[PDB]
Every structure is written in structure tokens, then in C-alpha cells.
Amino acid sequence: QDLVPAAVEQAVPIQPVAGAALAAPAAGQINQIDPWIFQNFVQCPLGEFSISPRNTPGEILFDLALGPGLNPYLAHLSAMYTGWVGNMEVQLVLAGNAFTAGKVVVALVPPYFPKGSLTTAQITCFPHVMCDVRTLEPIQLPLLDVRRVLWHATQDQEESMRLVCMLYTPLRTNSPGDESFVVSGRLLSKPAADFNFVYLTPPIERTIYRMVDLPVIQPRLCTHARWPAPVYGLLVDPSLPSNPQWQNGRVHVDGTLLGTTPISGSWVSCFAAEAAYEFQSGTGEVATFTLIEQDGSAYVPGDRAAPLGYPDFSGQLEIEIQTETTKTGDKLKVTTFEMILGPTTNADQAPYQGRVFASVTAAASLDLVDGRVRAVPRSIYGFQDTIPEYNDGLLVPLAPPIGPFLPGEVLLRFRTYMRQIDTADAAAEAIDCALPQEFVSWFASNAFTVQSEALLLRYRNTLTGQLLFECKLYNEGYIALSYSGSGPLTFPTDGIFEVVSWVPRLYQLASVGS
Amino acid sequence: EASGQDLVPAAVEQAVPIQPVAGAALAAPAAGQINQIDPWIFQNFVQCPLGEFSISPRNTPGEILFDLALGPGLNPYLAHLSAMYTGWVGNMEVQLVLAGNAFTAGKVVVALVPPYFPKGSLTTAQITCFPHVMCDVRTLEPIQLPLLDVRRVLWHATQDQEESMRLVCMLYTPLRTNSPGDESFVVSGRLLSKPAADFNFVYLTPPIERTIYRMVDLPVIQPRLCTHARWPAPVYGLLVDPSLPSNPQWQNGRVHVDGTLLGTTPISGSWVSCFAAEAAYEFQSGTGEVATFTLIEQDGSAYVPGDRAAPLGYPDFSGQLEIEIQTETTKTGDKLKVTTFEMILGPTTNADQAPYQGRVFASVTAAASLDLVDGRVRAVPRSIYGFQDTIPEYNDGLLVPLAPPIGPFLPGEVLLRFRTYMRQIDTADAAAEAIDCALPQEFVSWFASNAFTVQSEALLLRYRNTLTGQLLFECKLYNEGYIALSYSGSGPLTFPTDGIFEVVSWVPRLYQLASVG
Amino acid sequence: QAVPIQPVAGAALAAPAAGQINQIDPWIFQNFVQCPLGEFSISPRNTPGEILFDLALGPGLNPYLAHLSAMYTGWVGNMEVQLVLAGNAFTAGKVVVALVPPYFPKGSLTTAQITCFPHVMCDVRTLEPIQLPLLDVRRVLWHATQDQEESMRLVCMLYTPLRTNSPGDESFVVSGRLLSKPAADFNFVYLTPPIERTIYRMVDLPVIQPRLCTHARWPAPVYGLLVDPSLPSNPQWQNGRVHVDGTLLGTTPISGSWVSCFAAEAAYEFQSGTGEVATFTLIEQDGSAYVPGDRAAPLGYPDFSGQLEIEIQTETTKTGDKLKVTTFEMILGPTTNADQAPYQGRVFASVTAAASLDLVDGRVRAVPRSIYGFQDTIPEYNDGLLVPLAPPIGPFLPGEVLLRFRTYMRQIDTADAAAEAIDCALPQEFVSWFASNAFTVQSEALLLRYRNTLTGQLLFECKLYNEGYIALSYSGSGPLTFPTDGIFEVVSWVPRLYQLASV
Ligand SMILES: [Mg+2]
Ligand SMILES: [Mg+2]
Ligand SMILES: [Mg+2]
Numbered sequence A: 001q002d003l004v005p006a007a008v009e010q011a012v013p014i015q016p017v018a019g020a021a022l023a024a025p026a027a028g029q030i031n032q033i034d035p036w037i038f039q040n041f042v043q044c045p046l047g048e049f050s051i052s053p054r055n056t057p058g059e060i061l062f063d064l065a066l067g068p069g070l071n072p073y074l075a076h077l078s079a080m081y082t083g084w085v086g087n088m089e090v091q092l093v094l095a096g097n098a099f100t101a102g103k104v105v106v107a108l109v110p111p112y113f114p115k116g117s118l119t120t121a122q123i124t125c126f127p128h129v130m131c132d133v134r135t136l137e138p139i140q141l142p143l144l145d146v147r148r149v150l151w152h153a154t155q156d157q158e159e160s161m162r163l164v165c166m167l168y169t170p171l172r173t174n175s176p177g178d179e180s181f182v183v184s185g186r187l188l189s190k191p192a193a194d195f196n197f198v199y200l201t202p203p204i205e206r207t208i209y210r211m212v213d214l215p216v217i218q219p220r221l222c223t224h225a226r227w228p229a230p231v232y233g234l235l236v237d238p239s240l241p242s243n244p245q246w247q248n249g250r251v252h253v254d255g256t257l258l259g260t261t262p263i264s265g266s267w268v269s270c271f272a273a274e275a276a277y278e279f280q281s282g283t284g285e286v287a288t289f290t291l292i293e294q295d296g297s298a299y300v301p302g303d304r305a306a307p308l309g310y311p312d313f314s315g316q317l318e319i320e321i322q323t324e325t326t327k328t329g330d331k332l333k334v335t336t337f338e339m340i341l342g343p344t345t346n347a348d349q350a351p352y353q354g355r356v357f358a359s360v361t362a363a364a365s366l367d368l369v370d371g372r373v374r375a376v377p378r379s380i381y382g383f384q385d386t387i388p389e390y391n392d393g394l395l396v397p398l399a400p401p402i403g404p405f406l407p408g409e410v411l412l413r414f415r416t417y418m419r420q421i422d423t424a425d426a427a428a429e430a431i432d433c434a435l436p437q438e439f440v441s442w443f444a445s446n447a448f449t450v451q452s453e454a455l456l457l458r459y460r461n462t463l464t465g466q467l468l469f470e471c472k473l474y475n476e477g478y479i480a481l482s483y484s485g486s487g488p489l490t491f492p493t494d495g496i497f498e499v500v501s502w503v504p505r506l507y508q509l510a511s512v513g514s
Numbered sequence B: 001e002a003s004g005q006d007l008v009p010a011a012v013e014q015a016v017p018i019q020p021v022a023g024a025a026l027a028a029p030a031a032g033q034i035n036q037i038d039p040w041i042f043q044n045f046v047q048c049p050l051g052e053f054s055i056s057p058r059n060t061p062g063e064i065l066f067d068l069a070l071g072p073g074l075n076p077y078l079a080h081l082s083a084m085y086t087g088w089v090g091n092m093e094v095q096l097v098l099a100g101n102a103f104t105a106g107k108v109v110v111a112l113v114p115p116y117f118p119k120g121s122l123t124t125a126q127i128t129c130f131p132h133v134m135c136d137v138r139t140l141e142p143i144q145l146p147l148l149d150v151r152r153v154l155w156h157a158t159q160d161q162e163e164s165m166r167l168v169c170m171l172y173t174p175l176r177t178n179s180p181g182d183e184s185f186v187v188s189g190r191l192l193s194k195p196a197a198d199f200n201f202v203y204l205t206p207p208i209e210r211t212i213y214r215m216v217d218l219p220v221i222q223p224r225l226c227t228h229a230r231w232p233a234p235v236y237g238l239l240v241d242p243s244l245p246s247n248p249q250w251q252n253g254r255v256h257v258d259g260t261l262l263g264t265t266p267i268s269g270s271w272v273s274c275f276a277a278e279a280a281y282e283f284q285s286g287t288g289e290v291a292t293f294t295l296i297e298q299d300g301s302a303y304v305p306g307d308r309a310a311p312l313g314y315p316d317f318s319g320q321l322e323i324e325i326q327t328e329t330t331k332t333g334d335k336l337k338v339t340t341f342e343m344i345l346g347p348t349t350n351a352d353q354a355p356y357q358g359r360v361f362a363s364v365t366a367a368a369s370l371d372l373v374d375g376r377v378r379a380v381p382r383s384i385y386g387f388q389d390t391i392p393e394y395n396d397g398l399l400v401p402l403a404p405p406i407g408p409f410l411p412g413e414v415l416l417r418f419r420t421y422m423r424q425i426d427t428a429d430a431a432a433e434a435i436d437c438a439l440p441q442e443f444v445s446w447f448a449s450n451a452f453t454v455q456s457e458a459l460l461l462r463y464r465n466t467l468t469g470q471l472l473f474e475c476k477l478y479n480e481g482y483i484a485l486s487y488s489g490s491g492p493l494t495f496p497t498d499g500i501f502e503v504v505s506w507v508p509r510l511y512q513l514a515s516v517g
Numbered sequence C: 001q002a003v004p005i006q007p008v009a010g011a012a013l014a015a016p017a018a019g020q021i022n023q024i025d026p027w028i029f030q031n032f033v034q035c036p037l038g039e040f041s042i043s044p045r046n047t048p049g050e051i052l053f054d055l056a057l058g059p060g061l062n063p064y065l066a067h068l069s070a071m072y073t074g075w076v077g078n079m080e081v082q083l084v085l086a087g088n089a090f091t092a093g094k095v096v097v098a099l100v101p102p103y104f105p106k107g108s109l110t111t112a113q114i115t116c117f118p119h120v121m122c123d124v125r126t127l128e129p130i131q132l133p134l135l136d137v138r139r140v141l142w143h144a145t146q147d148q149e150e151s152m153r154l155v156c157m158l159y160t161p162l163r164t165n166s167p168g169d170e171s172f173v174v175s176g177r178l179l180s181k182p183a184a185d186f187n188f189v190y191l192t193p194p195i196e197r198t199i200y201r202m203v204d205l206p207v208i209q210p211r212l213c214t215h216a217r218w219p220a221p222v223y224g225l226l227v228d229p230s231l232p233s234n235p236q237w238q239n240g241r242v243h244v245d246g247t248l249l250g251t252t253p254i255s256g257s258w259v260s261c262f263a264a265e266a267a268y269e270f271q272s273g274t275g276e277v278a279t280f281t282l283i284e285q286d287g288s289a290y291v292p293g294d295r296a297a298p299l300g301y302p303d304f305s306g307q308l309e310i311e312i313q314t315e316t317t318k319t320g321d322k323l324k325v326t327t328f329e330m331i332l333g334p335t336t337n338a339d340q341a342p343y344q345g346r347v348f349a350s351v352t353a354a355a356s357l358d359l360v361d362g363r364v365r366a367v368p369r370s371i372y373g374f375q376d377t378i379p380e381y382n383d384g385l386l387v388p389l390a391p392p393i394g395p396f397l398p399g400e401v402l403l404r405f406r407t408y409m410r411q412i413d414t415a416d417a418a419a420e421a422i423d424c425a426l427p428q429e430f431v432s433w434f435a436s437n438a439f440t441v442q443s444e445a446l447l448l449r450y451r452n453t454l455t456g457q458l459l460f461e462c463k464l465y466n467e468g469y470i471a472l473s474y475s476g477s478g479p480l481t482f483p484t485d486g487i488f489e490v491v492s493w494v495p496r497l498y499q500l501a502s503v
Helices: A072-080 B076-084 B441-448 C026-030 C063-071 C428-437
Strands: A042-051 A060-065 A083-095 A100-109 A128-132 A139-143 A162-173 A183-197 A233-236 A271-278 A284-292 A314-323 A333-340 A355-361 A371-384 A409-417 A430-433 A454-461 A467-474 A479-482 A495-497 A501-503 B046-055 B064-069 B085-089 B092-097 B104-113 B132-136 B143-147 B166-177 B187-195 B200-204 B237-240 B275-283 B289-296 B318-328 B336-344 B359-364 B375-388 B413-415 B417-421 B434-437 B458-465 B471-478 B483-486 B499-507 C033-042 C051-056 C074-086 C092-100 C119-123 C130-134 C153-163 C174-188 C224-227 C262-270 C276-283 C305-315 C323-330 C346-350 C363-375 C400-402 C404-408 C421-424 C445-452 C458-465 C471-473 C486-494
Touching: A042 A060, A042 A072, A042 A162, A042 A501, A060 A183, A072 A183, A100 A139, A128 A139, A139 A183, A284 A371, B046 B064, B046 B076, B046 B166, B046 B499, B064 B187, B076 B085, B076 B200, B132 B143, B471 B499, C026 C174, C033 C051, C033 C153, C033 C486, C051 C174, C063 C174, C092 C130, C119 C130, C153 C174, C458 C486
Parallel strands: none
Antiparallel strands: A042 A183, A060 A162, A083 A139, A083 A183, A100 A128, A100 A162, A233 A409, A271 A284, A271 A371, A284 A355, A314 A333, A314 A371, A333 A355, A409 A430, A409 A479, A454 A467, A454 A495, A454 A501, A467 A479, B046 B187, B064 B166, B085 B200, B092 B143, B092 B187, B104 B132, B104 B166, B237 B417, B275 B289, B275 B375, B289 B359, B318 B336, B318 B375, B336 B359, B413 B483, B417 B434, B458 B471, B458 B499, B471 B483, C033 C174, C051 C153, C074 C130, C074 C174, C092 C119, C092 C153, C224 C404, C262 C276, C262 C363, C276 C346, C305 C323, C305 C363, C323 C346, C400 C471, C404 C421, C445 C458, C445 C486, C458 C471
């Protein structure tokens, strides 16, 4: 005769996994870590998520892989080792309330289980813990090294054990009351008794598990990335188009440039070519340009739409070039030519094929010598923020349009002003970019590894450390804010962007408002 | 024990030159669970899921009779259990049955081929360079062989297919018979297996029924209660006929066994030989009233010339088709009706019809103007005039992408045909009009919605009678979606249409069937 | 000898799950053989931090183990190496040899980082060979032979500079050489039928004299073999461009019956100018379609400028004159102002016709007959636009000059009498040989020797690069020719910075 209790605590039953006892006969060395790293839970580099009443049951809230990039001490230490082996421990804290109903499941998913779409029925067939959003204290699970190899390489990230969290039952509030309410979650970890490193190497600085940082410069000392001018403004505007297809100033956070984006800010909306002048009788002397790369290399039609640094807007542009004449009384001068960029055919512009056309009006036939030039913009006429002609009328390789966003998110814009010709309006013609120069470099100089889908940034006052807003910076290189206003909203331009954490894609920012 | 030896009892001990391999004990300190298989599964030999093969006097030395890879899919208990684990490891045991008639002669070789050896020819010169055994086709007792887990990992993933050891069987000398009368015997081999002592699985996983094992299964429906896949009608007959063209090039009703649709095959049997288009009407002094249709897809979306010859469900035959259309009129007293046009399908030697590009013209006889309003239509057939079973004119004289013709077959093999009849006009004929397909429409839905994983080249089916539980014949279903029987007669031969098809085994393309009938 | 490292197990860890453990001939354990790419020179002008050699563990380090590797599936175990330096008592300087593990990220190292591995430091005045272990640090139980995986490397750097005197005529280098053999714990895994197409298989050339070959840019024999340094040093030809591993570059064809020709579906009509004009809609010379992709024109299309004659067979439904061969006149020259676009698939040519000679429209194949006003310059592939090309031949080290295979054309020249030369980089037998053998590439270049077969006296040595051009070390100011009845033979893989000897 026996008594079965209704209330039992909760636990995960395990079979022990061997670490360095399997690895040691074919490792070079087996290296120990400081014994007090085994004593403290420390927040994970990806250690923030949220829960809303807009999430639906089945959604995945976080997803973590075993290994050294879960602890900031272990990630600092991996710069001087070639491999790793052993077990870990994770801790979870939820900041909910008394009005909040809901459950989540945290499952342990092994390597080589096909990463498709899990359902709510299936998540409880793994080892798991059942948690609800009203808990005051933290929950912990083990994370074991179930594997087919003898050890792992710190610089190639292969298959390991994962930690998946799913929303089990919907999240509800009793009185309507709180539907703008978000639950915060945080993740923390330490290593368990049986974790080692493998082979001592020189400490390399540009390893993986090195954390991203931004350059410490205020946005008003910087340089616009689509037109050769400083940065003057910083704002967000729902009235404008949401998914622009700009082609300069676009870079991945892992460091790969895309579009015609150059490294230097002295290539921006400028070009270089071989020159050839003729004097068709009607208008004037006409210059046909055979395009090259600005470092003097040849141009080959490839996977961009033009050479690096080409203007990505429409309208009539003014250039200044050097000219060497064959008259009497002059040998060198800065000449002006007038050029049309937009979809304004009858001129047959095809910078994708390596030929552009321009002209200056002249009652003479000034014999200008053929050679090599560098053209720089002077003024713009009828500027539309739309792509120019790249082929004659044909489509070219492009970079995808900016996006996607979540419901409620909008795009952050850096603004500058262009020199223009205008007759009736004396307003300042504005142009935006997503990331300024000083940011497209510092990427592609550093080559970071993205470790998640977005980066959470805080923007502060350099003095008094006040918080101005929070934002998501996605891997593709654009920033989002949570903002549901209708008109514009501009921000002070002398702050500094911080780095907080890697976050998931479904992360819910706090809303900004005028 | 048996009457009359006249032959070899056992290909028993030949030594195989190989070392003992370690199984689930190298993997155990790297899992975080203790797992285990039912001790009674280790206690009897059961037929393998790819477990049948033939040897005929038509085969030549160097042909591969079977080629098995080590893993869960060699046993039916183990292929069921692998749906709820990640990982496997260990050795197996196999049994070979080859007990031909005492009047036969021949040899085969079975080799142990390691991981990472190229897949390709395997000439008869290099198969004996492996650890191998040589076998007579007359051996009475079953021959037993080891299949060992030579590997440089600690275990294997169940939902991958990795490098493991293989077991390859090749015909070594031809098969002959010195019996005085009229025919040479075929040998019927079987493969059986069971796990060895240290086979295990690794980590428990949600049981997911769409795994890479899980053999195909057909729907339990009778042929005479299915829907034709080239004409909108029931299925009525089922027969073979060696007098009709052998390798047709039908475009509708084609589907891969793994779920890929071929040609212009739709999913709904309500799209077969219909179309949806944007219409425009005119009245003139000549043809009468011409209707011009620009085609879209039938759900309602646009059409673009692509990897097919026409939209989905377009009729793949020649003739003159009359259709029926809903139309409006700008007359008073009459609102909406059903009107009938006709349309020629063939080349016509001068035409304005390119259904590849989306251009189709119809017409109706009319003395005055029949003012019919424009809009959206869906055309269905009513009758066929001058039926020809040859492809229509897709692009007037071009070469559009087409699904290949049905074939090849082995010597002696003919095509199984599903038959229905059409509505027609005929002056001097009173017989029906027959159209044939390869698989009926329920089988296209089954394969498109199931996404199976094939094993070798064909499936072996048997056809059973429902009223008496009798097996009538056996056929081969090739992975490209056509069925073949073995028949060497001249007259058509028909079959009842109140039976079921049932899957038996995976087979090679050189499998030889018993003939009907 | 003693570095800070633990002993590594070979067959004790592989044997449970291998099928066989196979032994090697005991006399192979008694000889140190030269490793491939194990040798350097140190000069007084070298800068500390520069890399002397870089070698990975496996069967390819030994010539006997690379042969034996073709009848096996795997390998395991450790090796041992010797380093031999040639200095004397009146030198100074140092080197460091490090043991770098399997997954270290490749890049570049400094002298500060090289001492952070397990290493030895060695003085250039050392007398005996310096002996070391090369161990199998690994995450698997054995390695597959028809595969290359990560293994331990051995890396040598110059640590402090060389200090010496020199005479007036030469300049005193210190030389080094690395030799190897297997350690007692080294084995193979499972006996397989021997393979001929293995990854440890050396490049070889066809045994054919240059004068019996076929020219790669004009359909005719090869008549010369020269080196001329007054010509354009970096040409950009588009035919006869092949990679040593067998990839065809440019518009290079496999067969010599395609060089400087084209096939097309022709269309004719009379114009009251020169006469019957032909619109050639180009096709691939084997009957398949043509789509503008990676290269400038279809395969084999000529790649020089001028005005060219072409012969085509016509059919005329005239009763009394049906089939005949008619020579047209195409002008594919430089910037010669008529809308020629091979890259899109259409060209034009016509003939002086007094009347409208009936010529039906059908399939044709053009062959050249003679050239008029020939320049060595890219044709007009697209009207005035740019086209996907192949990079210019190069680059060459200081002193290096391109070797040229020369032949002669069919000229039209009214006020000249000397014949027209034209060059290529390789004949048409070295092109299809690389395309059929599909070799595996090891360093950057191969060292060849041009020898005479009658006596056995070598004419020079050259450097066949991976992209497919030859380079000799030359200093003279005029063309220097060679006899066209020698034989090219392969010596070894060399690095790019390898200094040949003079000609
Ligand atoms: Mg303005
Ligand atoms: Mg009839
Ligand atoms: Mg000449």
C-alpha cells in the first residue's frame, strides 16, 4: 500500500555524457578553465526576448545552441583555443504580473532533427520544463553534449544540442485593461562540471564570438552615404515610401557590401572614365565616356548595376572635370558639362554596359584632348528619389528593397541637403540614407559574425546618459523603431548608439512618441 | 529430409576476410538517454522491404541483382521504430534463399563494399577484389552473411542517408537448363534479415509519420469507382492491347511516384480538358460570330508560357471540340444563357491558334449579330468530332517543352490502360469512342499530397478480386508513373474492375514477371 | 625534439570500427625522402616574418605512401620529419618551426604570434638535421583517402635576419630541405580495387614534338617557337585559354575543326549596293542553340580584327545550277562602323553581285579563306558596348617573358611580301589533354624542361602557370627562337616566387 502525491517538484532526468574522456587520446592538449566560472550564472549575449498578446500559440520565442558563445567569459577565452567539449546549464527569468495568464515550454532538441516547423503537440515529446508567466523565481535546465565527434572546433559551428522555447497556451489579460502589456524575458548560463578547451593558440582578436561594437562618434560629425555632404538631420517619417530601393550606402553587418556601395566617401555619386569629344553641329561639343573603376582598374560588367559609387537617383546633374585644350593662351581648366540621369531615353544611357553621355554648349568647336577624367557632382535638377537608367531600357541586377518590418515598425533615416537649381521654390531638397559612411566602413573592416537576426541598440545623451529610444538593427543593415504616429518626428543629432544584445526577429520594442 | 538431393546443401563456411566491428558500445557515453529494442525482435528472420529478385536466362553476367545499404530500412520492425529516434548504430544479419530446380545451373557473387567507394559500374572484374562469397543457384539451405558497420563516426542520423557498408549481388555466369522440354526455369530469390546483438537507437523523438522509410501505399478504391484523368467521365474498362501504339506521349495524367506533376497535369478532376479565359466577341459576314479567348489559369490567376505546353488541364488530343459558355446579351427580355461554340484542335495547316502563348479562337453560326457581352468564361466540352489521339497544335510550328513518351519496357512487357468513352458525332459509325490513361485521377491526388521517398526503380503490385479474395495478376509500377504487365498475345485482354491494388516490394527494372495468362 | 604536447593514438582508436588494419613494407620505415614543396633559400635581403614552408600531414608527403594510397579506403597515424640547413661558422640568424593544429584560421602571422604555438627555435649554424614529430590531432577515428580534410600543419618562419659577408660575384644564401618518413604508428584501412583517377596523381604532357601539333588560333600547322620581348607583354586572346585542371576559358573550343569558324542559319537577299547580303543568325557548331551568357561569342568564333573571307555551300533552285561554294566578305575589324554584334548572335556579309542570284535560305557553316589588313586586337563583339571577357595573360615576375607558338596565315597584301605571323599560348593538343585528364592542382606552377630526344641535352626550363601560359627568364632585346623538335617534360610543383635560370 502506497501514497501517490499530487504535487511533485519538476526535474529533467539525464544520462551522463562524457567529455574529455572521449576527446583526450586524439586531442593535442586538454586545457582547464578558472574554477570560479563554474559558480555564477551570467547573462547570455543573446539574452533578451518578449511576449505579447499578439503572439500566437506555436511561435518560437528563443532558440540557443550549446557552446562557448553562450557565456561572455567562455567567449573571451575561446580566442586562444582551437576547440571545446562539454556540458552547460541555462537559467530563465520572466517578468510578468498577477493579471497575466499563459504557459511556455522549453524543450531540449538533439542534433540532426530536421529544422522545419514544430507544433504544440510535438514539443512535449522532448525533455522539457513547463513554465508559466506568473513565476517569481528562476528556472534552470541542463544542456548536454550529445554528439558523433570527439570534440568541436571553435571557429566552425557545426551541429549541437539546442534549447527551444515555444508559446504553449495563449497570453491573456482578464480586464481588457492591459493589451499594450509586454512580458520581458532574460537568459543566463554557466558551464557544468565537465567542460574543457582543446589546443592553446595565439590570441586572435577577430575571431567569432567577438561581440559587435559601433564607432564612438556622434551622428552630426559623420558623413552622408548617398551624397557628398555631412549629416544634418535624424528622423522617422511614415508619410514617405516604406521599402525604398536605394543602391548606395548599403552593407551587411557581417561586412559584405552590396549594390554600388563604395568604401570611401570620396567615390559617392562620382565616376571616372576614358574621355572622347565631338562636335555634332547643332547643340555643342559632346563627351562620350568609357567608364572605369575609380582606382584606375578596368570595369567588367558583373553582378552590380554600375561601377562602385554611381549615382542612384534621377534628374539632370552637373559635373566638373579637368580639360586640356589646344587653343592659344590656356592649357588647363575646370569645365562644366550637363548630364541627364533619369529614365529620359532618346539619350541611350547604359552605365551597366560602360557608356554615358554628356555635353556643354559652345558656339565654337573647342578641341579637347582625349584622356582620363574624374567627374564630381555640382548641382541637381528635378531630383526624384528613383533609380536612374542603368541599361538603355532594360533591367539590371539590383539590391532588394529595404524591409521587411513588423506591424508598427518604421524606418530610421539620416538626412542631408543637396545643391540645386530652382526657380519658383527656395526650399532645401532632402535625401536620406539608411547607414552613413563611418558605418559602412567599420563594417568590411571588422568582419563580424551575426549570431542572431537583429541587434538591440540604445541611443543616449552623451551627457547625463538619458535614454532617447530603443531600436532594432537587422543583419541586412537598416534600423527600425516602434512608432505609430502619422506625421514626422525628428531627434537630436549629438547622441551615441550603444549595443545591448542580440534579439530574435519577433522582438517587441517599446513605442516612441512625440 | 528432402526428396532427392541432386545438388548442393550449403554455401556454408567460406571464410570472409574481415574483423569484428563494435556497435552500440562506442556510442553510449555520447547519448543522454538509455534506449533499448524489444528482445523478441532479435529472434526471427523477416523478409526485407526490398526483398525479391529474379534471375532469368535473359540476363547477362555483370548485372546487379540486388544492392542493399546497411541501416534501419532493411527490416520492417526497425523501419517502423526509426520514426521516433534520431540516430542508429550497429551490425545486421541477412539470409539469402536460392533453391532453384535441379535442372538449372549458374553462379552469383555477393560482396562487402565499404563506405566511400564510388557508385557507378562495378564491372565483373573488380567485384572479386572485395570480401565476397560465391554461390550456386541450386543451394537448398539459406545462405547467411554478416553486414558490419565500418565507420569513422560514433553513430548515424536516421533522417539522413550517409555512407555505410553495402551488400552487392551480381550474376557471375549465365543461368541455363538442360531439361528436355520447351522452357527454361526462372529462379525466385528472397532476402530476410534481423539485427545483431549490439544494434541500438539513440535519442527519442516525436513520432513523425512522414519519414524517409514508410513504404508507399495506394488508396483502397476500386477502379470502376474512380475518375478518368484525360476525359471527364467515369472509368469503365481495363485491358492490355499490343496492337495500339506502345510509347504514347500523353500530356495529362502524368505524375512521379515521389509527387512531382508532369506535363499539364492538374490536381482537380474538374480541370481536365477545360479552360478559363478572357473572351471577346465579333459578328461579321464570314465565319458568323468569332469568339477570341485569352487564357488564364483556372483558379483565376494569370498564365505565363513556361515549362509546359499549355495551361493546366488542356486537352492533349486532336479533333474538333464544341464547347459551352455562359454569356450575357444586350437584348431586352433575355438576360443570361448557355451558348455553344465549336473549335478545331488540330494543325489545320493555317491557324490562328497558339495555346502555348495563350491564343485560342472559336466561332458559332449566326446570320445576324448575337450581341454577347464580354467578360470571364470557363469552357467545358460537349462533343468530339474526328477524334485523334495525337498532341494538338500548341505552338504553331515550334518546339515547346513536353513530358517524354511512356517507356521503356522490357521485352514482353506491355502497358496497362484505363479506359472510358466520349460523346461524339458520327455519320456512319455506331461504336463508341475510346480514350485511355495510365493512372486514374485519384492516384494523382494521392501521390501529389503524400511526397514519398523512393528506394530503387519500381514497385511490385498484385491485383486482388474483392468478391472472392483471388489474385489475378502481378505488375510493375515504374517510378515514372506507368504500369507494365507481361503479355505475349495478339488479341486484347480485359480484366474485371472490382478489385484492389496492393504494394508488395521494391524491385529493380530488370525484374521479370510471370506472364498473363 | 621536446615540444609541449601529449601523445596521439593511431590504430588503437581506429581498430574497433575499421574492417581491416593493413601493414606497410618495413623497408619504408628506414628512409627519409624529400617532401614536395619543402625547400627555401634565405638571403641577407629577406625581412623577418616571412614564411619558408607550410606542410600538412597525410599520404601525399611521401612518394611511396601516395602510390599505396590508391588500393585503400582510409589512413591513420603519425609521421616524423628532418630539417637540413646549409650554413657555416661565419653566419648569424634564426628560424622557428611551429606545429599548427587542424582548424586554425588561415591568413597571415607575425613573429610575435609564431612563438605561441608548440615550436622549436633553430640557429642557422646548426650541424645536424633537426628532427620533429607530426601528429594526427583529429575529431574522427580515421581519414578517407579520396578526400582532403583538416590535419596538423608544419610552418617555418624567418625569425631574425641573416648577417654575412659576400664576394663580388655571388651573394651567399642559406638553403634548407625537409625530408620525411612514417612513424611506427601509421596504418591504412581497407583493401579496395586500385583506382587510376586518384587525387595523388601527377600532371604529365603528351609526348608530341611541337612541329606536329595544331595551332590554337588559326586552323593550320605550327611553324615556330620563339620568345620576343618587344611585343605586347600582356595580350588578351580569347581562344586557346585552358586551366591546368581542365576548365576552358574564353571562347575556346575542344576540337581544332572549330577554330576561327562559325555555323549559322543564313538569310540572303539582293541589295542594289554590293549585292547579295547575308544575315547570319549564329548557332553552336554542333547543332544546339546559343544564349548570351558567360563568354563573348559562341565557341570558336574568331578573336582578331580585320576583314575576312568565308566559304559557304549554297543551293539554288535554278534548273542547271544547284549546289556550289560561294565566298562572301565579312568585315569584323576594329571600330569599323557597322553594327556588328556577335554577342547577341547576328553578323552580316555580302558579295559583289551584278544581279539577284537566287540563293535559298538554310543551314550553313563558314570557313576562312584569307585575311585582309590584320591587327592583333579584340574584334567588335558588341556594337560599342562591353562584353564578358577573359583576363589578360599575366602577371609575370621581374625578368619573365611569355613564350609564343607562332604560325602563318593566308594574306592579301598588294604592296608587301612578308608573311603574317600570329601567336597562341598553347597548341590544340595541350588544350584537350587538360580537358580530358582533369588533374588536381597543388602549388601555383609546374617546372618543365625542354629537352632534345636525339642526344638528351636540355634547351631551357620554363614555368607553366595554372591559368595556362609559359614563362622563361630572359634579358635580351630581340626575338630568340628555338628548335621545334624537342619534348616537354614535367619536373615538379613550384611556388609562384620561384626564380628560374637564364636563357
Ligand atoms: Mg527644389
Ligand atoms: Mg468514330
Ligand atoms: Mg602583311
